[PDB]
Amino acid sequence: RKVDYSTFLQEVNNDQVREARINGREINVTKKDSNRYTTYIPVQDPKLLDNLLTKNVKVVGEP
Amino acid sequence: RKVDYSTFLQEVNNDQVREARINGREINVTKKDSNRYTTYIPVQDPKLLDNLLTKNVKVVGEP
Amino acid sequence: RKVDYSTFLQEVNNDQVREARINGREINVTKKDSNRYTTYIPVQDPKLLDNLLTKNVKVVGEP
Amino acid sequence: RKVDYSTFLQEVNNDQVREARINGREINVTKKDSNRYTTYIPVQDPKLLDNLLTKNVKVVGEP
Amino acid sequence: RKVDYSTFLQEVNNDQVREARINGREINVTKKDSNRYTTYIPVQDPKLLDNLLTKNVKVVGEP
Amino acid sequence: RKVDYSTFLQEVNNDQVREARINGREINVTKKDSNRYTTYIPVQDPKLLDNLLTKNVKVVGEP
Amino acid sequence: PFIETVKMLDARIQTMDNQADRFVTKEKKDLIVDSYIKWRISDFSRYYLATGGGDI
Amino acid sequence: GVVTRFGKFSHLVEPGLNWKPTFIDEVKPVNVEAVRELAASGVMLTSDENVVR
Numbered sequence: 107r108k109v110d111y112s113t114f115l116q117e118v119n120n121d122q123v124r125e126a127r128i129n130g131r132e133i134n135v136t137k138k139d140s141n142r143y144t145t146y147i148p149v150q151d152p153k154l155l156d157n158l159l160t161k162n163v164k165v166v167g168e169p
Numbered sequence: 170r171k172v173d174y175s176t177f178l179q180e181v182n183n184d185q186v187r188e189a190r191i192n193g194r195e196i197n198v199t200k201k202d203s204n205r206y207t208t209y210i211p212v213q214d215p216k217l218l219d220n221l222l223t224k225n226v227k228v229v230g231e232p
Numbered sequence: 233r234k235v236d237y238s239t240f241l242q243e244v245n246n247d248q249v250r251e252a253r254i255n256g257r258e259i260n261v262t263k264k265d266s267n268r269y270t271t272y273i274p275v276q277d278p279k280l281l282d283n284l285l286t287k288n289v290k291v292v293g294e295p
Numbered sequence: 296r297k298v299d300y301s302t303f304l305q306e307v308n309n310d311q312v313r314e315a316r317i318n319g320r321e322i323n324v325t326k327k328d329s330n331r332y333t334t335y336i337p338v339q340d341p342k343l344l345d346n347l348l349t350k351n352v353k354v355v356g357e358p
Numbered sequence: 359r360k361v362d363y364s365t366f367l368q369e370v371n372n373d374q375v376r377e378a379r380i381n382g383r384e385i386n387v388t389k390k391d392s393n394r395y396t397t398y399i400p401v402q403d404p405k406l407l408d409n410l411l412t413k414n415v416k417v418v419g420e421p
Numbered sequence: 422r423k424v425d426y427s428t429f430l431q432e433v434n435n436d437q438v439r440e441a442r443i444n445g446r447e448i449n450v451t452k453k454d455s456n457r458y459t460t461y462i463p464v465q466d467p468k469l470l471d472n473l474l475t476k477n478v479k480v481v482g483e484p
Numbered sequence: 485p486f487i488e489t490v491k492m493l494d495a496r497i498q499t500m501d502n503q504a505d506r507f508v509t510k511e512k513k514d515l516i517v518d519s520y521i522k523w524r525i526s527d528f529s530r531y532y533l534a535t536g537g538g539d540i
Numbered sequence: 541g542v543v544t545r546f547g548k549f550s551h552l553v554e555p556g557l558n559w560k561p562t563f564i565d566e567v568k569p570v571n572v573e574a575v576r577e578l579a580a581s582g583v584m585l586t587s588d589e590n591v592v593r
Contacts (some may be wrong), residue, residue, distance in 0.1 A: 112228040128337035131230070146230030147338075148191040149218055155338050158301075165300045167320065167335030173292040178285065184579065194293070202578065203571040209293030211254030214281050237417045238410075258421070272419030274380040275399075275407055314425075317463035344466055347427075354427045356446065356461030364479040384484075398482025400443035403470055489554060539573065 107143040109135070114145045115154075118161055125164035170206040172198070177208045184224055192231035233269040235261070240271045247287055255294040296332040298324070303334040304343070307350055314353035361387070361395040367406075370413055378410060379418040422458050424450070429460045433478055441473060444483045491538040493531065497524045498540075543567045 109117075114135055117123055127134040131147045147154070158165050177198060180186055190197040194210045210217075221228055235243075240261060243249055251262035259271040273280070284291055303324060306312055316323035320336040336343075347354055361369075366387070369375060379386035385397045399406065410417050429450065432438065442449035448460045462469070473480055503518045525531045532538045541553030545565035553567060560567060583591050 110228060111230045112222060112226075115222065146232065148228055148230045149213070150215075150339075151218055152215070152341060153219070155340055156342075159304065163301070165337055167300055167337035169335070173290065175285065175289075175291045195295070202576040203574040209295060211291055211293040212276075212281060215278065216282070237419060238415070241411060257419075272421070274410075274417045274419050275382075275402065275404070277407055278404065279408075315463075341467075344464060345468075348430060352427065353425050354463050355425050356463045358447075358461070362479060362481045364474070364481075367474070383482075398484065400441075400480050400482045401465070401470065405470075 109143045109145050111145050111148055115157070118157060118163060121161060123161075123163055125166060126158060127166045127168060129168045172206040172208055174208055174211055178220075181221060181224055181226060184226075186224075186226050188227040188229060189221060190229040190231060235269045235271050237271060237274055241283075244284060244287060244289060249289055251290045251292060252284055253292040253294065298332045298334050300334055300337055304346070307346055307352070310350055312350075312352050314355065315347060316355050316357065318357035359395045361397050363397055363400060366397045367409065370409055370415060373413060375413075375415050377416040377418060379420065381420065424458045424460045426460055426463055430472070433473065433476060436476055439479060441478055441480045442483065443480060491532070493525060493528055493538060495525055495528075497522050541567045541569050 114123075114133070117135075117137070118126075122137050122139075123135050124138045125136045127136075133145045133147065134142065135145055136142045155165070177186075177196070180200070185200050185202075186198055187201050188199040196208045196210065197205065198208050199205045218228070240249075240259070243261075244252075248264045249261055250264050253260040253262075257272060259273065261269050261271055263269075281291070303312075303322070306324075306326070311326050311328075313325050313327050313329075316325075322334045322336065323331070324334055325331050344354070366385075369389075374390050375387055376390050377388040383398060385399070387395050387397060389395075407417070429448075432452075437454075438450055438452045440449075440451045446462050448462070449457065450460055451457045470480075500521045500523065501518075502520065505517050505519070506514060507517050508514045541555075541558075543550040543553050543560060543565055544567075545561075550565055558567075581593070583593055585591055
């Protein structure tokens with residue numbers, strides 16, 4: 107499944123995501139209801155990481 | 170159709186844009202009236218994504 | 233022709249440029265009196281795009 | 296042993312880290328009780344070093 | 359002849375440079391007394407370009 | 422002989438070195454007591470130049 | 485083939501969100517309400533014929 | 541789609557893959573399924589010599 111970046115940000119702002127695995131542009135989002143999907147970062151967004159950490163969202167990098 | 174970046178901006182602030190897809194430097198812009206035109210980014214703009222999000226404009230990433 | 237970057241800055245402050253076409257490193261400037269010349273950026277300037285926008289100067293990207 | 300980014304920042308803010316061996320994205324982290332693990336930087340972070348120096352932890356680089 | 363960056367910035371604040379030809383990593387500089395030298399950015403500094411623009415110092419890029 | 426980046430920061434905070442030869446990531450440092458060593462930057466640090474400039478520490482680049 | 489096409493109508497209960505609606509009470513105190521509706525297609529033939537085409 | 545053979549309005553074309561004589565007839569696509577929205581705002585004069593946005 108693919109979910110749009112703005113929709114993903116609206117979801118995280120509403121406390122719906124639990125963990126996010128970031129692989130470069132690609133992001134594997136897992137919602138709190140055990141639903142997984144994938145999104146892509148359009149352009150370099152400095153506010154993204156701050157928004158993720160602020161909303162108590164697990165963030166995981168990859169090799 | 171090719172449309173420059175500035176008028177795309179004051180269309181965004183005048184909320185005539187509905188969905189913008191950014192594969193690379195280019196943006197596939199869709200208007201509220203379902204008319205689509207391509208735009209090219211002159212140089213990376215940190216405020217671009219913030220302006221797009223605040224105006225409640227749908228943003229789509231690309232693989 | 234070629235024009236200094238500071239010359240372009242003070243030129244756009246006084247509002248007599250009309251069209252600014254950005255091709256990566258190079259800039260092709262169009263004057264209000266149909267005068268065309270070329271400018272180069274010293275180093276990445278975030279304020280450049282904002283300054284060009286606030287003075288109602290057309291900005292055009294290239295593929 | 297791999298540890299996520301968010302919990303690593305939580306430990307840094309809670310002061311259970313002594314020195315950080317940063318090698319590119321990888322961060323080899325040693326706790327104040329000499330516990331060793333590895334964390335990954337998902338996306339470029341502009342503030343991690345600010346908190347790291349605020350909490351007075353020995354940060355090192357790698358050739 | 360190569361001139362130190364700290365001395366360069368202090369001399370710019372002294373308003374004694376007239377032209378600065380910036381070549382990416384490199385800078386070719388002319389003093390007000392027709393003295394030519396060459397200097398180097400240690401790491402990217404937008405405040406450099408800000409200081410040269412506010413001091414009315416000529417800035418030159420090249421293809 | 423290699424020195425921690427953090428230790429470099431509290432050392433220069435104490436006004437104890439004079440020269441900083443910046444070669445990309447690595448830096449050649451001489452103290453006020455004519456002691457020379459090398460330090461490595463973990464990641465890009467914008468505050469580095471501001472801190473070095475504020476405390477009258479001379480910086481020199483390399484070709 | 486190549487002459488006949490098909491339209492899809494889902495029979496599941498479908499939700500619909502109304503957000504930031506403005507309503508004025510009996511005592512002329514305006515207050516914001518956001519609610520939601522859930523509807524199901526009782527009969528598909530009537531739903532297709534009465535509504536414009538077959539679009540939701 | 542609206543297909544016209546040398547500008548004579550040949551017919552109406554359903555979505556999918558289709559065939560046409562190249563360099564003879566042209567097809568113009570039009571968005572029909574999508575719903576279009578328009579925003580109209582203004583400072584407007586009322587009956588009692590009043591202006592409202």
